[PDB]
């Protein structure tokens, strides 16, 4: 417990997002042009994610976040694309950089923002471009403390 946890809390100041993220291939995610039938609904139900990144076309192109609580009053008879459902509600995209300190992302985390932040690195190896690596969650940091 507590001694492990205390230095966890202070190596918040030394670990970057780039050590505790989920890289983008293993992240639960949805194409916008996907459509609420009962099966997509169900697979989201037992996915056990409550907030899912919504991309168009390519996965490294996140346009929105779907909340579980959002699809409470969409009916799935109705075959409605997630594209539309996702700006029924403007949900925040939280963007953060690879070399951001973990405690800073934490401070960010309960400064209200979405508990899922998405990770960018700049790349220069030509115009510089941002480069999506994956997602970090508040629980990724939480576990960095409590283990």
């Amino acid at each position: 417990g507590p001694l492990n946890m205390i230095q966890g809390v202070l190596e918040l100041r030394c670990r970057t997002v780039e050590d505790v993220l989920t890289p983008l291939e293993d992240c639960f995610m949805l194409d916008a042009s996907t459509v609420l039938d009962f099966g997509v609904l169900a697979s989201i139900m037992q996915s056990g994610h409550t907030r899912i990144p919504v991309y168009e076309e390519e996965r490294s192109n996140i346009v929105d976040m779907l909340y579980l609580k959002d699809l409470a009053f969409v009916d799935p008879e109705d075959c409605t694309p997630l594209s539309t459902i996702t700006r029924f509600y403007n949900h925040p995209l939280h963007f953060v950089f690879n070399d951001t300190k973990l405690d800073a992302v934490l401070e960010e985390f309960k400064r209200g923002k979405s508990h899922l932040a998405i990770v960018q690195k700049v790349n220069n190896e030509g115009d510089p471009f941002y480069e999506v690596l994956g997602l970090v969650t508040l629980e990724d940091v939480i576990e960095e403390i409590i283990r």
Partner: protein, 154 residues
């Protein structure tokens, strides 16, 4: 990797730095142009998407291409500054869209030396752009841009 449109207001001038869209993502690309009140897009990258839907909806698209991570050639900067003042003359209020590939490069550069031409100090140009969009200009183009100086054309 393509980031969301970013507005830069200064002067009572308003630029929107954007990514290059696809023809698939084109509807939404037009739609943030009309949200931001852009009536003019300046493309400076390769031609990828068809321009006729956009001026169908009343947005002029201007093709002034110069190459990947190069500074603007002199023709391009002069045309840029003059288009900018003409459009902000024609209606005060509106936005000019600029985009290259991913809005982290040449288009921020043109916004930048527009700002310097407005008589914002240089590193307050870079200042202002890098706060909203981190790590935007590369090598050669900020080397370019301090050896740039304004005869205040705006």
């Amino acid at each position: 990797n393509r980031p969301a449109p970013v507005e830069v207001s200064y002067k009572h001038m308003r630029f929107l730095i954007t990514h290059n869209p696809t023809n698939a993502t084109l509807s939404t690309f037009i739609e943030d142009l009309k949200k931001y009140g852009a009536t003019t897009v300046v493309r400076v990258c390769e031609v990828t998407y068809d321009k006729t839907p956009l001026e169908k909806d009343g947005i002029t698209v201007v093709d002034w291409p110069f190459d990947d991570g190069a500074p603007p050639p002199g023709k391009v900067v002069e045309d840029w500054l003059s288009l900018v003042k003409a459009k902000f003359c024609e209606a005060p209020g509106s936005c000019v869209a600029v985009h290259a590939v991913a809005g982290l490069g040449r288009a921020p550069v043109l916004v930048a030396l527009a700002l310097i031409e407005s008589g914002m100090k240089y590193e307050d140009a870079i200042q202002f752009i890098r706060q909203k969009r981190r790590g935007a200009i590369n090598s050669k183009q900020l080397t370019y841009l301090e050896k740039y100086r304004p005869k205040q054309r705006l």
